[PDB]
Structure formats: structure tokens, C-alpha cells
Amino acid sequence: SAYDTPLGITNPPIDELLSRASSKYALVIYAAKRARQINDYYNEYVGPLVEPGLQEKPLSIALREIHGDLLEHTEG
Amino acid sequence: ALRTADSGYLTRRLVDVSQDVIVREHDCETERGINVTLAERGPDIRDAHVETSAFARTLATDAVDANGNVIIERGHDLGDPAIDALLAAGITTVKVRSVLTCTSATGVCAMCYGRSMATGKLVDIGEAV
Amino acid sequence: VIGKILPVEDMPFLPDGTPVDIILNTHGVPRRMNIGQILETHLGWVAKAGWNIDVAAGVPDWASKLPEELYSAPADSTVATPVFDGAQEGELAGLLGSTLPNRDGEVMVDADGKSTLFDGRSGEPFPYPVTVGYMYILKLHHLVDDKIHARSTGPYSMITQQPLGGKAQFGGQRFGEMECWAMQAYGAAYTLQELLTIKSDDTVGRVKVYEAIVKGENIPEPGIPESFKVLLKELQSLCLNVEVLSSDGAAIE
Amino acid sequence: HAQNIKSAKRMVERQRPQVWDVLEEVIAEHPVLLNRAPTLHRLGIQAFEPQLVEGKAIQLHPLVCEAFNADFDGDQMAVHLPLSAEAQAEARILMLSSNNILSPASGKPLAMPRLDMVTGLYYLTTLVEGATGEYQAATKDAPEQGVYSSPAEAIMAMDRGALSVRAKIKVRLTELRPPTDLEAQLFENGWKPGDAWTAETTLGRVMFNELLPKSYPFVNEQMHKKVQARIINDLAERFPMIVVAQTVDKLKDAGFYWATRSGVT
Amino acid sequence: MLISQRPTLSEETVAENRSRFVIEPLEPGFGYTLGNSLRRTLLSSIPGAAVTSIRIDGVLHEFTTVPGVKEDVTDIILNLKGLVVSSDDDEPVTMYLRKQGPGVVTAGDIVPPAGVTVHNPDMHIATLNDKGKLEVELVVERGRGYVPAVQNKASGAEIGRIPVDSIYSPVLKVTYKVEATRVEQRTDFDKLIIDVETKNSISPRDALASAGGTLVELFGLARELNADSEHIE
Amino acid sequence: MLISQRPTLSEETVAENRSRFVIEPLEPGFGYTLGNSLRRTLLSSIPGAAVTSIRIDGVLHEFTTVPGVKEDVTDIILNLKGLVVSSDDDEPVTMYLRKQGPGVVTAGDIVPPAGVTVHNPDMHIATLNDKGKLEVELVVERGRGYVPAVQNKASGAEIGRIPVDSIYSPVLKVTYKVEATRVEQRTDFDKLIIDVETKNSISPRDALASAGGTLVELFGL
Amino acid sequence: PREVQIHLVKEVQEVYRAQGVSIHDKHIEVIVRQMLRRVTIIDSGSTEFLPGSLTERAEFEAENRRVVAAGRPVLMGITKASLATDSWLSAASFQETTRVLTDAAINCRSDKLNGLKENVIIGKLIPAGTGISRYRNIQVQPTEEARAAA
Ligand SMILES: [Mg+2]
Ligand SMILES: [Zn+2]
């Protein structure tokens, strides 16, 4: 199961994210709320956890983080 | 010139009828289903329309045969292995869970729908199927 | 549409150097059932480069039903073909058997009307001969300067509280019902609930979103569209007492 | 760059040279929802990473054209910028074209090669008798000739006028996994991350399998759109979606590259 | 006359022998101009040693069988084409490989004459069975690029001689692609991504330096004619 | 078996505007890309002069006509694009073409300053009558390749100045063919012969030398 | 119902199968379901039910027990089924706004917004994908093991 390397938005790969959260629909909010938090930190102020890029976006950071298993979620 | 607008209207009606049908819960748990053909008497055979009828769906009943050595239980996604294993096992009919026979009050339950085509896994617990 | 404008060098060229002006896809000939463009291309080549049907002692067989005073023709020789009784396959076939007026003394095409093109991109000659020629092509009135639109934020219409539509009026695009169905079929809830609220109708949303994006803050939660408020107030004006309330506690308009 | 907002608004309004260094830094993984009216099916909208291009046209991907039912015969498309983090996410996860290769109809890969790519790969992979650098298996005097140590060697033998891409040559492969029957007869214990095995194929089939993923077994067949369909279906059901997204893109690039040197005119 | 600014080059090693070089950001077009030339140069041009023809004890007019080994003449040839070498002769230098008894024959078991050196002694050739001895003569030549099986009254005339396709080229597989990259305002400024897989002998950077050398030495001939209207660095 | 002999670049001549060049020996199938490099360098990036902006004192824009001329100002501009000129100074130089009364205004009737040369005096621009007087100044600048008609609104240029789509390409056409020369046996080599055809702004030699120079500069190690 | 449920699918797939298109049955079955989720009442009524009306199956079953009614299976047109809904906004949006607004207004019926086409109209996050409470109200906290070093 080799893809050489991902690039841009397709990094990180979705199948490795779907393992982490219950479903893509959860993963969306999972990433989104975290991203809204990361957005807020620059201005709930926790993060960024993983060492971010120089000019990197909160969505990329959030979607990177979920893949790393630095976060945990509760389904309402 | 006519086809596109007619197809659009058909699409509109078919959307506005099934606008409410979502995957509300995971499993309501019902033994009811539909009996798919899947190799009717032979070889002594594969149906041409297995991919449309049987594939990417959860099984309703435990796949009992003449002996009763249940090769597969109820609630399997029906990959080719399952179909060729059931063809090899020696049964000429399989009972699959359908939205048709889903006991869920609001929307449908994920299991009854089957493996979602978009994802390729078990349908998610909010999809507007 | 014009895919790419290839810098003349990289575009494939004829062995004399002449770089071809357009390339049309082959696959869009058999399925579409218009081989007129190919005949027009060929007879185009026959027309552009001067030609002389090297007659013989008494005419060639392929030009038996051929017109007189059209055996020889010079460079840039304009040709007429009556739409239903013009040039034919066997006439074109022989016609492509032309002279070599390219200032050099070598022919570019062949008897089949297939030139050995050179790839300007790689540098190599393409492994099979290509149908080059001179198709008369027309620029249509469908131009990007008319059709291209863009709108982050600008003027909103007075009577309808969505962006006034138009290329001329610096307008946004129509996010229709069939677009909403596709969005719902995904289940991109927040997307649709952004598009049909702060990105269109919501007067507090359309002003806050710009400020929020330019400041670089969280996009504020889309409240209620003007398209709901207008329906609410319309039904209140129709004397239908519509009221908003949750499980515990009633809401206010 | 800008002292205050208004000077930034003015700078971007004026289209000054400094904006272009920033606009990529801004657009970096900030997806856009492309729509083609009439919006029939779910994939009739798809999210994409916007790469900046000089011009006044939207450079769509060739595969997603079937997912839009969009020809390039004047057909317009509508870009939408999802603004919210939630929207940006929804775009990225749900409806980013890579993530939804399979149609919501038969679960068949809709983003599969069509038109040029198909004839490209068909030519690329199809076998031809009486070709250049062909497998002869000579008697008494000469060796077998059409036998090559590496796909590299075969590529060098192709680029230099000596080998024809559609020749039934015997190549010794390392990176690629063999056919299911030839897996058993050779190794049947260790794997082939950097081992070696001989295949009686076409250079083109090796250049094709080079596109398909590492652990995917060999095909050794002419790539009919149905064969591509069942291959990308097998990739879809067996492998992750990103592997499919990438492999079908390599199939696109290779397909188009070989569509030219196909000689379909 | 002209002034192009920043044609910067950077290397990105994948393996010890494999590398991706990136040349950027070139003026709209220049990617393909130097790309295919750099490729075909890297392939065809750079001078290197290789096995041109071999001869094995026993085979006078056999198909592809050698007494007392598991492998075939074809597979042996295929393994020997892989046998990478570096000579300082510029002439056909003859090497002898002999091994007796069971087991395997590795690349280190060969005895290279003065000038020639094998860079990877830990490389498989053939598996020998019990009660057998392999004695093979390899004709090593210097050359450039890829050269198929030569039949110049040497391979055809001689009894035990067999010719093999010579991969003189120190580089095995060089491919390349180009992408648009914004530089100031305009896009379509080409960034050359050039992918190279060398043999252990020479380093990709040294191969590219040699290719660049032969290319600049070549177009020097053209430059020399006038050398009036030029570009910048 | 090396071919220890550097490639000889021998210059033929078919015309003063167009010339062949033969390069040999080379490695089998190495010629095509070598020729392509030269072709692509030539057709793309060669230093050249051409008309950047014209300014007729009478007419105030492109999309009108001059009194007593046959061709309209658009077609005059479109013909003045067809001119071939060469300049030494890369800085912007202003040529003058002044003609009053009847006759055929040709490219040869233009009066360039010191260090600017017109290389097609025979070329037809406009045909006049006794009523009509054509006074046109043509701004020339040294560039390379093609540039779009730069807008005078952007720069500090007056309403009178008309931009024209400059073509800084003194090469007109380039091609090449490679001879197989010798069979597969006894080290086969590829000889490339390239035709270079200029506008007469510079000779093929100068162009090919400029291209070769550009490629030599462009191959960094 | 179960036989006609197969008959519809069989008779509506055959056209796609003939015209070289492939849809999976379940998709049709979501429509063929939405068709056969109603009953026509013959007599009795019990709780002010009309003879020859269109009432939903699940809510009819809840009344049918009558702890202290005669309804038959009916197959209705997708337009009639789309017209037959509890949510007054959707029925008003579909067709005959006056007829349904008048019928609803007198009944003083409270729309639950269980359907999404209403949530589109009122402009609230839709009950599907990423707008259901179990998704949209997900509380993600970063793990103490990750927050420890930071
Ligand atoms: Mg169309
Ligand atoms: Zn259920």
C-alpha cells in the first residue's frame, strides 16, 4: 500500500485519517473546530501541537495533527 | 434538446420525494431483507447483474447451506470473496438487508443501506443517501 | 476553446521549419462524424502550396472527371468546391500529389497527405506521419473577456439582499437548487449554510465575513438569511402567526 | 508589504508585482468548489487546490470532465471559495476530487482515463509482431537478442533507435510485482523490494506497471478502457483512495505522453 | 543584448545512486530547451566502460544451457549486462571469471587486469551446482551511451563468442518533467525536475557536471563564431 | 570504441538572409535534441530591435484613419509590425518617416538616426494622394522574443503615443535534419544540418552564435 | 409490498441495463421505499382518520394497536408522496402554497425541521453529513500526553 508521497491538500492521506475519527463527517468537524481553535490561538487557546510550517494554514495543521494522534474527540 | 430538461424535472421530483431520507442511526437490527437471485441452479454460473443487485450490501440472515456450516454471518459488506464463497458453498439465493425492509422510524439505519459507493466502506451515520 | 498558446518554438513543425498554427484532436473526428475538416485541411494543403498534376501523354485516370484549367496552380491559390458537387476522395488523393514550392526543393506532405512532423517540445520526429494542412478556422464571439467573472465583495442590490447578477455590474454567480442538491448529497452542511447565508442573503454576515477574513479571525456562525426573514415577514403580512421555539424556551424574531 | 488595509486593498486593486509572491502563499491548500451547470450528480460539484495560471481560463483536470459531463466546447464553470474552516474542511475531505474517484452510482471509478489517455495507454501497452528489438530466441549462431537487464536499459534502447515500445521483449524487473501464477513459481517465501525476476512483456507494459503501485501485481495485457476500469476498480477496492488518485494521474500523464507518439491521426 | 536572472540549480538525492535535480525558475520555455538535451546527453554522451561481448566454456551452438549451473545463458548475460566497470584503456580489454564447485559466483570473484576496477564486488552472476566449473571470458570496452549486440565479423565469425548489448552510460535511467512557477508577475516560467538513476561508479552530480561539460564544450563551437549578443548569470 | 573527435561546426550559405550549418560527428540520436535546443533558443530568445510605439501627429489613436491614405492606421501599424530593423543602443530610439503629397510610402522612405538600420526598404506601408500628408515617428527598442503592446496609461506616456505589438525576433525560421551516415557496424554517428533563416536584422551566423552563447551561458555546473 | 418493491427495481433498472448505464439497486430502493411508506384507510378510522386518505405507516401502526381501524397498502406517485409531508414549509415550497398554508394554519402544526429542504429555506445547518448534533457538537480536546511538553 505505497503512494510514494502526497502533495498539497491530499497530504495527509484520507484513509489514514478515516481510521482516527468515527467517519469523514466527524473528521470534518474534528479538523474544523481544531482549525478554528488554531485560528483563535494567533488572536480556547491550545496549539499548535505539531511543529507548523513557516507560512502554513490551520486546516493543514489540524489535518496533520489528527493523523499524528495528538487529539481526542467526543461524539454528542 | 428535450431530454436534459425532462431528466432535470425527473431529478427534481426524485430529489424532492427523497429529500428527507438520511442515515440517522447505525443499526435498528431487523432480520427482514430481500432474497437476491445470485446463480439460479448451476453450474451442474454467475448472474450478469450481481454488481447492481447484491454487491456493497449487508447480509440479512446467516448464510446457511444444505449441511449448515454457516460460511458467513449476517452483516458482511459482500466483497467478491463472499459472493464466490457463497457460489462455491452451494446456495442459489442470498437474503440481503435493504432500505425497503428497514425498521428505522426516522430516515434509515447505516447497516440496512450497505457499503457506501462514494467511500467504499460501510455508509456513514449522517449520509443523505 | 483555446487550451494553451504554445510559444511557436515548442509547437510541432514541418521539416522546412514552418511551425503549425493550430493542432485539433483526432478523437473528436470519428465520434462527431465531421471529416469535412480533414478534406478541407488536405485540399487546404493542396491550395496553400502551388501544384502541377504532371499530366502525361494524355491525362491521368484519377483526373478523368476533373475540371479543365485546374491541372496547374501557383502558391496561395484560392479554391472553390460546390458544397454537394465539389472535389472528391480520388481527386484529393491525386491532388495531394503536388509540386514542392517551399523555397527548398523537397515535399513536406506525402501522397496520403500525412507530413513527418518534428516535435518542438522534445526535438524528435514523431514516430508516425501526422495529417497537417490548411483548415480555414473562425474566431467565434465566445471570448473570455465577456465570460470571465470574479467577486470577493462589492455592491449589493437594494430590493433583493443577494449580490446583483451580471458580468457588467461586477456581479457574483447563481448557486442554484441543483447545486444545493449536490452539496447536500455530499453533506457539506457548513458550506451550503455559508453559501445560502453570509455568502448571499445575510446583511450582518456579508459585512462581518469580509472584516473577519481581512482581520484573519474565525468566520462568524451564519445567523439567519434575509430569504428566511422576508418569508417570515411575508407570512406575518399574510396573517399566518408563525413563531420560533425550541424544546425548552421560545425564541424572538 | 502594505502599511494599512486600505493600501493593501489599493495594491491588490492596482495588481502590483508584490501581490503574486503572496497570492500562492495565500492560495496554498485553500480549496475551491468548481461547478458545471447543469449540476446533475453529486460530483457535478468538486473541490480543488487552485494553482495560479496566466490567462483568463480555468485549467480543469482531464479526468474530472466526466465527473462534470463538461466538454471544452465553450462550456463555462463556476468557482466558489469556501470561507469557513468547516467549509474548507468539507471541501478538503468530502468532495475534493481525489477523495471521491468512485461515482455514487455503481461505485465505479468516474475519474478514470477517457478519450486520448485511453488510446495513449492502448498503444503504450498493446503488443505488435515483427517489431524493433523483438524477442527472437535464435538457434545455434546468435543469442535471443530481445532480452534486457533493466527497464532503464530498454528505455535507453528505445530512445536510441534500436527498440520499438510495442515489442514482445524479455525484461528483468526488480521494483514491479509479477503475475499471481508467476509469484508462486519463482519466490513463494520472500518478497521483491529489490530482488529480480524475468517477464516476457512490452517495454510499454513495464512503463505502464511502473505507474501502477509498488505492491500491485503485473498485468501484461493491452489496456482497453474496460481493462483500465477493472484495474482501477481492483486498485479502488484493494488499495487506499490516494493510491488510486495518484496511479490514475500517472496513467493520465503517461497516457497523454503516449497519445502523441501513438500516431492516431 | 539580453539579461536573464536566477537560473539556480539544486540537488535532491533519493538513494546513493538515484537523484532528482531541480533547475529553476527558467524563462518561459527554457525548461524543455535544455531538458531533453540534458537527458539525451546524460544518457548517450558521458564516457564509461561496459561488457561488449562474452564467451563461456562448452557452448559451441547451444540454446541457453551451461553445464553445472542452475541459471540460463540469457539470465547470465542479463546479470553480466548489470556488471558495472570503469577502465582507463579506450580499447577492448579482456577479463576472465573462473569458479569451481557448488554455490554462487559473486562480482568480487572476477580478477580485473591493470586499469579496470569493479565498484560493487557484492553482486550476483550465477548459481553453480555440484561437480561443475564455470570459466567465462568478458570483453570490457570503453564507450558512450547504449550500443546493441554488434555483429562486425567478431560475434558472427567466432565459435564460442556471444555479443551483449553494451550500457557504457554511467547513468541508467534519466527522465524529466517541467512545471510553471511564478517568479515576479508572469507564470509559465519553467522549473525543470530532472530524475536520474546512475550506476555506483560515478555520482549523479559528477555525471550532470560531465553532461554539462560536453554540452557547454559542444555549444562553445557555436558561441565562438561571434560572441557579441549574450545573456546574464 | 570511442569517437575521440570534437564536433566541427562548418558554416554553409544558401542566401544572405538564410544559411545552413553542418555539425558532426555526434552520438546516435543525439543530433535531433541538439538541433532542437538551437532552434528553440533561436525562435524564442535572440536579442533583436523592433517598433515598440508609433506616433502619427495627426490621428490620436489606432482605430481611426489619416486624411488621404489608402490603408487605415490599424493596417499601417499591422504593416509597420512587418518591418525588420536593427539598433546598437538598447535604449529607446525614435525614428522619423515624413512624406507629403502623392505616391507609395515604402519602408525605404523612413529616416533612422545614427546606429539604427532598416533591412527591407522595398516593403509597402501606405499609398497616399496629393491631399494626404503622412508624418509618423516609430520608436524602436532592443529586446528578445515577443512582448504584448505595453499600455501608455501604465507608463508616463502621452495620449499621442500608439503602442504596437513588438516582435524582438530577428530570426524568421529555423529547421534541421540529421543524416544516419554509416551503417550500425563500425561506430555509427549522426551529423545534424540546420537551416537558419533571419529577417536580415542579423545574419544566420550572428543568430546561431547568439543562441549557442545563450545555451553555453544557460548550462551551469 | 415486497414483490412490487422488487418489480419497480427490476422494471426501472432494465432501462439503464439496456441503455448501457449501471446504477446500484439500493439507490432505486431509497425511492421505491419513499413510495411505499403510506396506507389508504378503508373504514373505522378510530382517531378522526378519513376513508381514502394518505397516512404514514409508522404513525398508523402506533394508532392501529387501539389498546382500549382498517388500512390497506397503497403505491403513490413521487410528486404525491413529496406533496404528502408533515413539514408545512416543504409542502408549501413544492406546490399549491395557499391550499397547504390554509390547511396547516388552521391545524397550528409545529414543524420539527426533521427534513432538510426546510432547514435550507430557514437557512439553518441541514440534518445530514456535518450538521447532525452527534457531528456538529463534537468536543475535540488535545490529549494531555501531547499538551504535557507542548
Ligand atoms: Mg458539449
Ligand atoms: Zn435497520
Domain spans of chain A, in order of start? 1-76
Distance CA C120, CA F37 (A): 9
Distance CA D221, CA D243 (A): 21
Interface of C with A (CB under 8 A): 187, 190, 216-218
Copy the grid coordinates of residue C121: 517540445
For E3, counting Cβ atoms within 10 Å of its Cβ (0-12 exposed, 13-18 middle, 19+ buried), the class is: exposed
Residues sharing a CB contact under 8 Å with residue C115, sequence separation 6 or more, in sequence order: C14, C15, C108, C109, C129, C130, C131, C132
Closest chain B residue to A27, measured at CA? B124
Q: Is E31 on the interface with D (CB under 8 A)?
A: no
Distance CA D10, CA E65 (A): 81
Statement to judge: residues E64 and E100 lie in one domain: yes
Angle (CA) D183-D188-D194 rounded to 5° is 70
For E9, counting Cβ atoms within 10 Å of its Cβ (0-12 exposed, 13-18 middle, 19+ buried), the class is: middle
E196: nearest Cα among E169, E164, E218, E214: E169
DSSP 8-state class, residue F72: -
- Please tell me the distance between residue B37's alpha carbon and the centre of ligand 2 in angstroms: 22
Give residue for cell 528578445.
Answer: F144
Q: Which residues of F12-50 are buried (b: 16+ CB within 10 A; e: fewer)?
A: eeeeebbbbbebbbbbbbbbbbbbbbbbbbbbbbbbbbb
Distances (CA, A) of C16 to B74, C103, D98, F152, G28: 73, 9, 45, 39, 62
Q: Per the CB < 8 Å rule, is B119 touching A22?
A: no
Q: Per the CB < 8 Å rule, is C8 touching F43?
A: yes
DSSP 8-state class, residue D42: G
Residues sharing a CB contact under 8 Å with residue E153, sequence separation 6 or more, in sequence order: none
Q: Is C185 on the interface with B (CB under 8 A)?
A: yes
Backbone angles phi, psi at D31, to 5 degrees: -65, 165
Distance CA E49, CA E93 (A): 10
Statement to judge: residues E139 and E93 lie in one domain: yes
- Quote the distance between the C-alpha of residue G138 and its chain's center: 26
Do residues C208 and G149 make contact, with C-beta atoms less than 8 angstroms apart?
Answer: no
Copy the grid coordinates of residue B53: 443487485
Q: Per the CB < 8 Å rule, is B117 touching D241?
A: no
Do residues E117 and E86 make contact, with C-beta atoms less than 8 angstroms apart?
Answer: yes
Does residue E34 sit within a domain? yes
Question: For testing the chain B interface, which of A24, A27, A28, A29 should be mutated: the one with the most B CBs within 10 Å?
Answer: A24
Copy the grid coordinates of residue E211: 553532461
Q: Per the CB < 8 Å rule, is D38 touching B4?
A: yes
Statement to judge: residues E60 and E159 lie in one domain: yes
The single-letter code of the amino acid at F198 is: T
Do residues D157 and D163 make contact, with C-beta atoms less than 8 angstroms apart?
Answer: yes
Copy the grid coordinates of residue E121: 564486488
E9: nearest Cα among A7, F136, F219: F219
Does residue E146 sit within a domain? yes
Do residues F14 and F173 make contact, with C-beta atoms less than 8 angstroms apart?
Answer: no
The single-letter code of the amino acid at E1 is: M
Copy the grid coordinates of residue D182: 508467476
Question: Which residues partner with E128 through β-bridges?
Answer: E69, E103
Q: Per the CB < 8 Å rule, is C123 touching F35?
A: yes
* C–D CB contacts, 8 A cutoff, strictly below: 113
Angle (CA) F59-F60-F65 rounded to 5° is 35
Distance CA E168, CA E143 (A): 5
Count Cα atoms within 13 angstroms, Cβ side, for F77. Answer: 22
Copy the grid coordinates of residue B48: 450478469
3-state secondary structure of A34: helix
User: Mind telling me how many Å the CA of F6 is from chain C's nearest CA?
Assistant: 22
Q: What is the CATH number of the domain that holds E180?
A: 3.30.1360.10
G28: nearest Cα among A74, B129, F123, F132: B129
Copy the grid coordinates of residue E29: 520555455
What is the dihedral angle through the alpha carbons of C11, C13, C18, C20, rounded to the nearest 10 degrees? -50
CA terminus-to-terminus distance, chain C: 51
* Closest ligand, as measured to the CA of B24: 2
C12: nearest Cα among C102, C145, C127: C127
Backbone angles phi, psi at C203, to 5 degrees: -65, -40
Angle (CA) C102-C104-C110 rounded to 5° is 60
Resolution of the structure, angstroms: 3.8
Q: Is A5 on the interface with C (CB under 8 A)?
A: no
User: Mind telling me how many Å the CA of D22 is from chain G's nearest CA?
Assistant: 30
Distance CA B77, CA A29 (A): 27
* Closest ligand, as measured to the CA of B29: 2
Number of H helices, E strands in chain B: 4, 4
The single-letter code of the amino acid at D184 is: A
**Axis crossing angle, helix F31-44 with helix E204-224, rounded to the nearest 10:** 60
Distance CA E187, CA G67 (A): 78
- Please tell me the distance between residue B112's alpha carbon and the centre of ligand 2 in angstroms: 5
For F132, counting Cβ atoms within 10 Å of its Cβ (0-12 exposed, 13-18 middle, 19+ buried), the class is: buried
Q: E229 to chain F: which residues are within 8 Å by CB?
A: 46-47, 202, 206, 209-210, 213
A8: nearest Cα among D96, D80, D34: D96
Question: Which residues partner with F198 through β-bridges?
Answer: F171
* Closest ligand, as measured to the CA of D36: 1
Number of H helices, E strands in chain A: 3, 1
Copy the grid coordinates of residue F94: 525614435
User: Mind telling me how many Å the CA of B119 is from chain C's nearest CA?
Assistant: 11
A 10 A CB-CB count for D143 gives 21
The single-letter code of the amino acid at E32 is: Y
Backbone angles phi, psi at F135, to 5 degrees: -120, 110
D102: nearest Cα among D213, D237, D215: D237
What is the C-alpha radius of gyration for chain D, rounded to an integer number of angstroms? 23
Pairing of strands F8-11, F124-128: unpaired
Q: 3-state SS string over D52-118?
A: CCCCCCCCCCCCHHHHHCCCCCCCCCEEECCCCHHHHHHHHHCCECCCCCECCCCCCECCCCCCHHH
Distance CA A64, CA E95 (A): 56
Do residues E22 and E10 make contact, with C-beta atoms less than 8 angstroms apart?
Answer: yes
* Closest ligand, as measured to the CA of B23: 2
Backbone angles phi, psi at B109, to 5 degrees: -95, 140
Backbone angles phi, psi at G5, to 5 degrees: -60, -40
Do residues A59 and D85 make contact, with C-beta atoms less than 8 angstroms apart?
Answer: yes
Copy the grid coordinates of residue G25: 439497486
**Axis crossing angle, helix D85-93 with helix A24-42, rounded to the nearest 10:** 140
Q: A76 to chain B: which residues are within 8 Å by CB?
A: none
Q: A36 to chain C: which residues are within 8 Å by CB?
A: 218
Distances (CA, A) of D49 to D24, D26, E187, F161, G115: 11, 12, 17, 43, 33
3-state secondary structure of D45: strand
Q: G122 to chain C: which residues are within 8 Å by CB?
A: 224, 228
Give the method used. Answer: cryo-EM
What is the dihedral angle through the alpha carbons of F85, F88, F93, F99, rounded to the nearest 10 degrees? -40
Distance CA G42, CA D208 (A): 67
Does residue E189 sit within a domain? yes
- Secondary structure E strands in chain F: 8-11, 18-24, 47-56, 85-87, 93-100, 103-106, 116-118, 124-128, 133-146, 162-163, 167-168, 171-179, 191-198
Distance CA G106, CA F214 (A): 87
3-state secondary structure of F54: strand
Give residue for cell 542452475.
Answer: E70
B6 marked as part of a ligand binding site: no
B102 marked as part of a ligand binding site: yes
Domain count for chain E, please give it.
2
Distance CA E194, CA E192 (A): 6
Do residues E44 and E171 make contact, with C-beta atoms less than 8 angstroms apart?
Answer: no
3-state secondary structure of D220: coil
> Domain span at residue F118?
48-168
Q: What does the longest C-alpha to C-alpha distance in chain E come to?
A: 76
Does residue E230 sit within a domain? no
For F110, counting Cβ atoms within 10 Å of its Cβ (0-12 exposed, 13-18 middle, 19+ buried), the class is: buried
D127: nearest Cα among D222, D207, D261, D208: D222
Q: Is E48 on the interface with D (CB under 8 A)?
A: no
Do residues D33 and D79 make contact, with C-beta atoms less than 8 angstroms apart?
Answer: yes
B97: nearest Cα among B71, B75, B82: B75
Does residue E100 sit within a domain? yes
User: Mind telling me how many Å the CA of D260 is from chain F's nearest CA?
Assistant: 17
Distance CA D45, CA D91 (A): 10
3-state secondary structure of E117: strand
- Quote the distance between the C-alpha of residue A11 and its chain's center: 10
Q: Per the CB < 8 Å rule, is D107 touching G24?
A: yes
Q: Which of C189, C202, C228 sits opposite G129 (nearest CB)?
A: C189
The single-letter code of the amino acid at D29 is: E
Copy the grid coordinates of residue D177: 510485482
Do residues B22 and B107 make contact, with C-beta atoms less than 8 angstroms apart?
Answer: yes
Q: What is the CATH number of the domain that holds D146?
A: 1.10.274.100
User: Mind telling me how many Å the CA of G92 is from chain C's nearest CA?
Assistant: 11
3-state secondary structure of B10: helix
With the C-alpha atoms ordered C87, C89, C90, C96, is the resulting torsion angle positive or negative? positive
Helix (H), strand (E) at residue D236: helix D225-238
Judged by phi (left if over 0) then psi (alpha if -120 to 50, else beta), residue D116 lies in: alpha
3-state secondary structure of E223: helix
Distance CA D262, CA D117 (A): 10
Q: D89 to chain C: which residues are within 8 Å by CB?
A: 190
Distance CA B86, CA B72 (A): 8
Backbone angles phi, psi at F91, to 5 degrees: -60, 155
Pairing of strands E190-198, E166-167: unpaired
Count Cα atoms within 13 angstroms, Cβ side, for C165. Answer: 5
* Binding annotation of D: 71, 73, 75
Overall residue count recorded for chain E in this entry = 233
DSSP 8-state class, residue F127: E
What is the C-alpha radius of gyration for chain C, rounded to an integer number of angstroms? 32
Distance CA E3, CA D189 (A): 61
B21: nearest Cα among B110, B97, B95: B110
Does residue E232 sit within a domain? no
Copy the grid coordinates of residue G147: 499538551
For D3, counting Cβ atoms within 10 Å of its Cβ (0-12 exposed, 13-18 middle, 19+ buried), the class is: exposed
DSSP for chain C reads -------TTTS-B-TTS-B-S----STTTTTTT-THHHHHHHHHHHHHS-EE----SS--GGGTT--TT-SEE-TT------TTSS--HHHHHHHHS----BSBSS-SS-TTS-B--B-TTT-SBPSS-B----------S--HHHH----SS-PPPSSSSSPPP-TTTT------HHHHHHHHHHT-HHHHHHHTTTTTT-HHHHHHHHHHHHHT-PPPP----HHHHHHHHHHHHTT-----B-SSSB---
Overall residue count recorded for chain A in this entry = 76
Q: Is E36 on the interface with C (CB under 8 A)?
A: yes
Do residues B124 and A24 make contact, with C-beta atoms less than 8 angstroms apart?
Answer: yes
Do residues G127 and G116 make contact, with C-beta atoms less than 8 angstroms apart?
Answer: yes
Backbone angles phi, psi at G41, to 5 degrees: -90, 130
Judged by phi (left if over 0) then psi (alpha if -120 to 50, else beta), residue G37 lies in: alpha
B129: nearest Cα among B50, B21, B36: B21
With the C-alpha atoms ordered B76, B78, B79, B81, is the resulting torsion angle positive or negative? positive
Q: C190 to chain A: which residues are within 8 Å by CB?
A: 32
